[PDB]
Design an enzyme around this catalytic site. Structure first.
Site, PDB file in Angstrom:
ATOM      1  CG  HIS A   1       6.106   6.473   2.690  1.00 15.00           C
ATOM      2  ND1 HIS A   1       5.313   7.538   3.058  1.00 15.00           N
ATOM      3  CD2 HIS A   1       5.791   5.462   3.536  1.00 15.00           C
ATOM      4  CE1 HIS A   1       4.552   7.189   4.078  1.00 15.00           C
ATOM      5  NE2 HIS A   1       4.821   5.934   4.389  1.00 15.00           N
TER       6      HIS A   1
ATOM      7  CB  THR B   1       6.565   1.620   5.713  1.00 17.83           C
ATOM      8  OG1 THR B   1       5.979   2.926   5.691  1.00 17.83           O
ATOM      9  CG2 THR B   1       7.173   1.364   7.088  1.00 17.83           C
TER      10      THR B   1
ATOM     11  CG  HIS C   1       1.302  -1.214   1.805  1.00 16.53           C
ATOM     12  ND1 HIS C   1       1.743  -1.890   2.925  1.00 16.53           N
ATOM     13  CD2 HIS C   1       0.799  -0.038   2.254  1.00 16.53           C
ATOM     14  CE1 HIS C   1       1.510  -1.156   3.999  1.00 16.53           C
ATOM     15  NE2 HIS C   1       0.939  -0.030   3.619  1.00 16.53           N
TER      16      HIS C   1
ATOM     17  CB  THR D   1      -0.798   4.199   2.504  1.00 13.80           C
ATOM     18  OG1 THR D   1      -0.485   3.051   3.299  1.00 13.80           O
ATOM     19  CG2 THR D   1      -2.182   4.710   2.884  1.00 13.80           C
TER      20      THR D   1
HETATM   21  N1  LIG Z   1       2.925  -0.308  14.142  1.00 10.33           N
HETATM   22  C1  LIG Z   1       3.196   0.078  12.822  1.00 10.33           C
HETATM   23  N2  LIG Z   1       3.713  -0.993  12.209  1.00 10.33           N
HETATM   24  C2  LIG Z   1       4.069  -0.918  10.921  1.00 10.33           C
HETATM   25  N3  LIG Z   1       3.908   0.237  10.237  1.00 10.33           N
HETATM   26  C3  LIG Z   1       3.387   1.322  10.851  1.00 10.33           C
HETATM   27  C4  LIG Z   1       3.034   1.243  12.134  1.00 10.33           C
HETATM   28  N4  LIG Z   1       2.543   2.442  12.521  1.00 10.33           N
HETATM   29  C5  LIG Z   1       2.592   3.284  11.460  1.00 10.33           C
HETATM   30  N5  LIG Z   1       3.104   2.601  10.441  1.00 10.33           N
HETATM   31  C6  LIG Z   1       3.424   2.864   9.091  1.00 10.33           C
HETATM   32  O1  LIG Z   1       4.544   3.994   9.010  1.00 10.33           O
HETATM   33  C7  LIG Z   1       4.020   5.067   8.448  1.00 10.33           C
HETATM   34  C8  LIG Z   1       3.623   6.063   9.550  1.00 10.33           C
HETATM   35  O2  LIG Z   1       2.619   6.992   9.130  1.00 10.33           O
HETATM   36  P1  LIG Z   1       1.753   7.796  10.268  1.00 10.33           P
HETATM   37  O3  LIG Z   1       2.016   9.245  10.161  1.00 10.33           O
HETATM   38  O4  LIG Z   1       0.319   7.560  10.061  1.00 10.33           O
HETATM   39  O5  LIG Z   1       2.141   7.328  11.641  1.00 10.33           O
HETATM   40  C9  LIG Z   1       2.825   4.549   7.664  1.00 10.33           C
HETATM   41  O6  LIG Z   1       3.199   4.250   6.358  1.00 10.33           O
HETATM   42  C10 LIG Z   1       2.379   3.285   8.412  1.00 10.33           C
HETATM   43  O7  LIG Z   1       1.942   2.236   7.428  1.00 10.33           O
HETATM   44  P2  LIG Z   1       0.664   2.521   6.423  1.00 10.33           P
HETATM   45  O8  LIG Z   1       1.142   3.324   5.234  1.00 10.33           O
HETATM   46  O9  LIG Z   1       0.064   1.153   5.922  1.00 10.33           O
HETATM   47  O10 LIG Z   1      -0.413   3.298   7.159  1.00 10.33           O
END
Ligand SMILES: Nc1ncnc2c1ncn2[C@@H]1O[C@H](COP(=O)(O)O)[C@@H](O)[C@H]1OP(=O)(O)O
Length: 214
Positions: free
Chosen positions: A66, A68, A145, A147
């Site tokens: 995905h 975000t 992006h 991940t």
């Molecule tokens: N404070 C935050 N701010 C922005 N994005 C977040 C934050 N915390 C988690 N995420 C993102 O939302 C999703 C939550 O996944 P998780 O189960 O680990 O909480 C992830 O894609 C993460 O980005 P990223 O993909 O760069 O790690």
């Protein structure tokens, strides 16, 4: 009474995920076997033979990949409530989009794919104010992006920070000449364990904008 998702974002279809997932794995193997990377391991890890980056990025997305847009934490995140209120968000909810992957990157912490958002997609990108200090001079959406993997001790939202750090160097002409040639594009060594594969042909993936509640 009505609480928000954990986060909004573009969730790739099953095949777009499989394709991008597989693509990311190939890169982590091609990069791991590249002599330009193996002679730079001292900047990547602090211990010791050869390293297998796939196992190194052991914490991977389990389901579909995905992109975000806005992390809401069911409404606890700052600016989450104002973001969901947006007409473009409610209008776009459940609708299909095509995301453009321009590059694949790697750092000591994260492995991801750089998304280049169109103008209409940038409407779904949050413009919350408590900015980072990494987005200065970079256009909004640069953080976009997917991940593909994280090291064992890494926090979420790190992949986004890593990308902005990488692009700040490219802006400053500090990316340097390519140190290799992989079949999908040119490889770059940006130092401090940071690497970037600028795809020859941009990779398009189908996705659905929606909310994840977990
Ligand atoms: N404070 C935050 N701010 C922005 N994005 C977040 C934050 N915390 C988690 N995420 C993102 O939302 C999703 C939550 O996944 P998780 O189960 O680990 O909480 C992830 O894609 C993460 O980005 P990223 O993909 O760069 O790690």
């Amino acid at each position: 009474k009505d609480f928000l998702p954990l986060y909004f974002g573009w969730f790739l279809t099953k095949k777009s995920s499989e394709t991008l997932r597989k693509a990311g794995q190939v890169f982590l193997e091609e990069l791991g076997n590249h002599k330009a990377f193996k002679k730079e391991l001292r900047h990547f890890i602090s211990g010791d033979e050869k390293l297998e980056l796939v196992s190194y990025f052991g914490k991977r997305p389990p389901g579909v990949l995905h992109c975000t847009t806005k992390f809401c934490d069911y409404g606890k995140a700052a600016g989450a409530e104002e973001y969901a209120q947006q007409e473009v968000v409610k209008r776009s909810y459940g609708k299909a989009f095509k995301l453009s992957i321009s590059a694949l990157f790697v750092t000591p912490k994260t492995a991801g794919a750089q998304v280049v958002l169109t103008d209409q997609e940038l409407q779904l990108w949050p413009s919350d104010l408590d900015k980072p200090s990494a987005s200065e001079g970079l256009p909004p959406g640069s953080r976009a992006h997917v991940t593909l993997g994280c090291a064992a001790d890494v926090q979420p939202a790190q992949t986004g920070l890593d990308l902005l750090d990488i692009l700040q160097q490219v802006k400053g002409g500090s990316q340097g000449e390519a140190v290799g040639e992989l079949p999908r594009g040119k490889l770059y060594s940006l130092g401090k364990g940071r690497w970037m594969l600028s795809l020859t042909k941009k990779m398009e993936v189908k996705a659905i904008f929606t909310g994840y509640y977990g």
